[PDB]
Structure formats: C-alpha cells, structure tokens
Symmetry: D2
C-alpha cells in the first residue's frame, strides 16, 4: 500500500500534463505551491518554455496562470488557492478520490488510503535481500 | 500508448515477485530466458540468495527451478519452456492478456496493444522541450 | 564529451550542499533563480526544512541577509553579479561551477571543467537508444 | 569511500565497454560470472547484438568469448577464469588497483579503499531530511 514515485516517473507524468497544457502561449505564468509543487512546476516551466515561475505559501485574478501542487487529497489547498487566484488553472500530478473534483486537471489516480512517497523525500540506499539465504 | 519501464521500476516489480517466491529454500536455482529474462533473473537471484543462475536460448526436467522471462504475450516461449522444463515454475514480470494464464506467476498487467520498452533498450538522453517557447 | 547529470546524482549533490549549510536555523529562506535554481532550491528546502521558497527571475526588497540564493551552475558570473546587486547580503550558492565562475559563488558542490558540456536531468528523458552494433 | 553506482550510471559504463569491444562480429558469445557479471553481461549482449549469453559459477578454451564480471579486486576470480578459459577475453566494469592489469579490459578505475555499492543491492527508500526543522 506504499506508492513509490521515482524521479523518472514524476518527470514522465509532468510531461504528460505539459502536453495537455499545450499550446504554451495561452499561459502567462506558473505558480508553484510551496513546496510540493516546486519540482512539478519547474518541470512544466521547462517543457512549456515559461520562465515566469512564482511560488505561493499556504499554512489576484489568476486568469492564464497555472497553479501547481504535487498532490490533491482533501482539496484544502485547492480551495485556498481560489481565494487569491479564483481564475487560475489549478493542476496537480496526483489526485486522491476526494480531491478529484476540485482541480482543473491531474495526471494519476491514487486511492485514498495509499501512501505516496515523493522522490525528494527518498534516496538510493542499500536494501537487504528479501531472503537471508 | 508507449509504456516506459525504468530500471528502478523493473527492480520494484522484481522484488514484489521475489517475496511471492518466498521462502527461497524451496528453490534449487533459476533459469533465465535469454535475453529478456537475464536481468529479472539476476534480480531474483539477488533477492532470493540464489547463486545458481542458468540461461536458456529458445530458437534436466526443471524440478525446484524458477524459469523467468521478461514478458509473456502469446505464450510461445512458455510452451517451449513447458516442454524443456515441465516440472519448473515459470514466471515473468509483465503479462499481456493472452499470456496471463500461461504463466505460474507474474507481476504487472499490460494491455495487448500497449508497446512496452525495457530499460536495457533505453538511456537517459537530451529531449527537446515540448514547446519551443 | 557530455557530463550527464541524472536525477539521482543531482539529489546526492544537493544533499551534500545541504549538510554544509547546516544548521538550518541560521537561514531565513531560499531564493531559487528561475529556472535553473528551482529544483536544486526545492531540494535544499526539503533538506533544511525551509518552507519559505521564493524565486527571482533575471531578464535578457531586502538585502538578502539570512537568505540562500541558489542557481544550478555558475560559469561567467552574469547571474551572480545581478544577484550581488539585488541581494548584497545573501549567501549565493550553486550545485555546479566552471572555473571562470568559482570566485563569484559563496559555495558550490561539483567542479566542472570549463569546456565540458553538462546536461541537467530536467532537460533529459528515458528514451530508446539504438544498440551500438547492428548485429 | 561511499560510492553509489545507480542503474543509469552502470548502463553508461557498460555501453562504454561495449563500444571498445567493437567490432561485434569478432565475438561468438558472452559468459557472465554469476552473479556480479549477469547484469553487465546482459547489457553487453544487447549492445553487441549477441543472443548467446551463458553463465559460470565459481565457489569459495573460450576463444572468441567475452567473460564478464562486475569488478576485479584481488584477481582471484580472474585466475579461475584464465584457467577455465585460457583464450577468453576477460572484462569487468570496475577495477581496483591490484586487479587492473589482470583483466583484458575495464571501464572505471576504483581506489582500493573505496566501497562501491551496485544498483542491484539498492533501492529507492525514504531518507530523513538532514535538518529536523
Ligand atoms: N506524501 C503524501 N502526502 C499526502 C498523502 N495524502 C495526503 N497528503 C498531503 C495532502 N496535503 C495537502 O495540503 C493537499 P490537500 O489535502 O488537497 O489540501 C497534506 C498532506 O497530508 C500521501 O499519501 N502522501
Ligand atoms: N519489447 C516488447 N516486446 C513485446 C511486446 N509485446 C510482445 N513482445 C514480445 C513477446 N515475444 C515472445 O517471444 C514472448 P511470447 O509472445 O509470450 O511467446 C516476442 C515479442 O513480440 C512489447 O510491447 N514490447
Ligand atoms: N546546462 C549547461 N549550462 C551551461 C554550461 N556552460 C554554461 N552554461 C550556462 C551558464 N549560464 C548562466 O547564465 C550562468 P553564468 O554563466 O554564471 O552567468 C548560461 C549557460 O550558458 C553547460 O556545460 N551546461
Ligand atoms: N560490491 C563491491 N564488491 C567488492 C568491492 N571490493 C571488492 N569486492 C568484491 C570483489 N570480489 C571478488 O571475488 C572479485 P576478485 O577479488 O578480483 O577475485 C569479492 C568482493 O570482495 C566493492 O567496493 N564493492
């Protein structure tokens, strides 16, 4: 019940999201939710050729701005974004069921009780064999 | 649709398969189908603590042997394996729907029409941004 | 030839940079230079437990005191000098450095020879590569 | 002396080794030393276009063949191999100082007091952040 997101896979998902976001010229900018959306944001910015990357922290119109986070679950962040950026295009990479109807787009379905680990919280490390033989 | 198998992901599936082949001592060795089964074979051998790794090329009876290939589709390979090693336990990492019942064990379901690419056939290389913006 | 930086390696270098910047609490925040500094910035923020990540874009207040400013690579020092003018008191770091730019950064991790071309993992992907022999 | 070798990096080395074993048709087969040489051997097989991959196990004439292991250190393994296959071309990916001239080819020089960790003994796992802040 643990979902491992490797860097390569994250990048594959982000490129899929970026192609759906084409043409790039419809967008003025990218706003990354600190800090889960920072990496997915950098990835969109690279693929869409958008240099205007901003961050917003959560403890303005927004039309033509992509607002990105890594995951939607409850949708609390999605709600909070709408306060200052009600016309923004809110997207995430991953979505759990309750958050699915609260985003403008997402790439991968994740079940509610699955724990997803993001690659910035992981590393390549020695792992003992499954069998002591 | 193009399915990309990264090394990290391949290894994750191999470990999932290995814990299903637990306990290890029930096995005497492993036979890898050249060349698709070579790497998954190596990984199984590591995770099970088995040094006896053999190979077979497809143009002894197999008792207590694991026979591994990367992907089952038609089951042509499975047939030959069953003829050479009727007493052997045949597994793959990936299975397309036709092959699904022709293996004793597998890990990942692949659609019939999806093209899967294995990491030994790929490499990390510059890829032009999706947008020229 | 080309120096390939994979995601795994970049992260190893960022963690090394993070350990040197310890203890975290001596820092108010992180300013990532868009776009090269964004991922290295995000990695630093995770490792130092800093939630306050800003960005700066250079084209073509504060003095930055207590802030880390991060970019991917220093070479000429064009970005560096703009960063000095804009943030005279920030600690300016990169992951990679070519010899021309070394004296202009407060800290970096990997020395890259001047004429080496380095490819960052956000510009790369896992793709089919034809075998070396046709046989 | 904490040297992490990832899958991508291993594959880069194996491709470099394959290139210097060119032209391919001068070889008739590859013999992988189990278990260290299996993945490298599999990679050589793909790159040189050799379907004929065998294995050999050593515990405690080979003409026109490549025998491959992951690393030479003492050369003890090389000795057994020269005895078994006096005309084989013996190659490794990595070589520590005592072993370097004891193989016909290698790619990476490794210091004696460096411990390298191969990617089949590792995995992507959660790593606590450097600061608890
Ligand atoms: N790494 C990881 N994080 C998770 C997981 N599930 C929930 N989250 C996060 C969701 N979250 C948010 O602020 C987003 P939202 O709930 O839509 O406002 C805080 C975290 O709990 C999970 O399986 N793995
Ligand atoms: N790389 C890759 N290979 C594939 C794919 N689908 C089928 N194969 C192979 C399956 N195969 C076999 O000999 C095994 P079997 O069909 O069970 O006897 C030959 C190939 O066509 C695919 O999506 N990608
Ligand atoms: N990916 C990669 N980028 C490079 C390389 N060498 C130079 N750069 C960049 C450095 N750069 C900057 O604005 C930073 P600075 O030169 O200190 O002002 C522009 C690019 O030319 C290289 O080998 N690889
Ligand atoms: N993964 C890894 N393995 C190592 C290392 N150094 C030595 N080895 C192995 C080399 N070895 C051999 O039998 C080869 P040889 O000594 O030439 O006959 C057994 C292990 O000690 C190391 O840094 N990393």
């Amino acid at each position: 019940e643990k979902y491992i997101v490797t860097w390569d896979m994250l990048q594959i998902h982000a490129r899929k999201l970026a192609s759906r976001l084409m043409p790039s010229e419809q967008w003025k900018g990218i706003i990354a939710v600190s800090r889960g959306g920072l990496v997915p944001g950098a990835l969109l910015a690279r693929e869409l050729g958008i240099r205007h990357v901003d961050t917003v922290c959560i403890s303005g119109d927004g039309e033509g701005f992509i607002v990105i986070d890594d995951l939607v679950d409850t949708g609390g962040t999605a709600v909070a974004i709408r306060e200052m950026y009600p016309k923004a295009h809110f997207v995430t990479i991953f979505a759990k069921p309750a958050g699915r109807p609260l985003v403008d787009d997402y790439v991968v379905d994740i079940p509610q009780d699955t724990w997803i680990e993001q690659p910035w919280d992981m590393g390549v490390v020695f792992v003992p064999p499954i069998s002591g033989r």
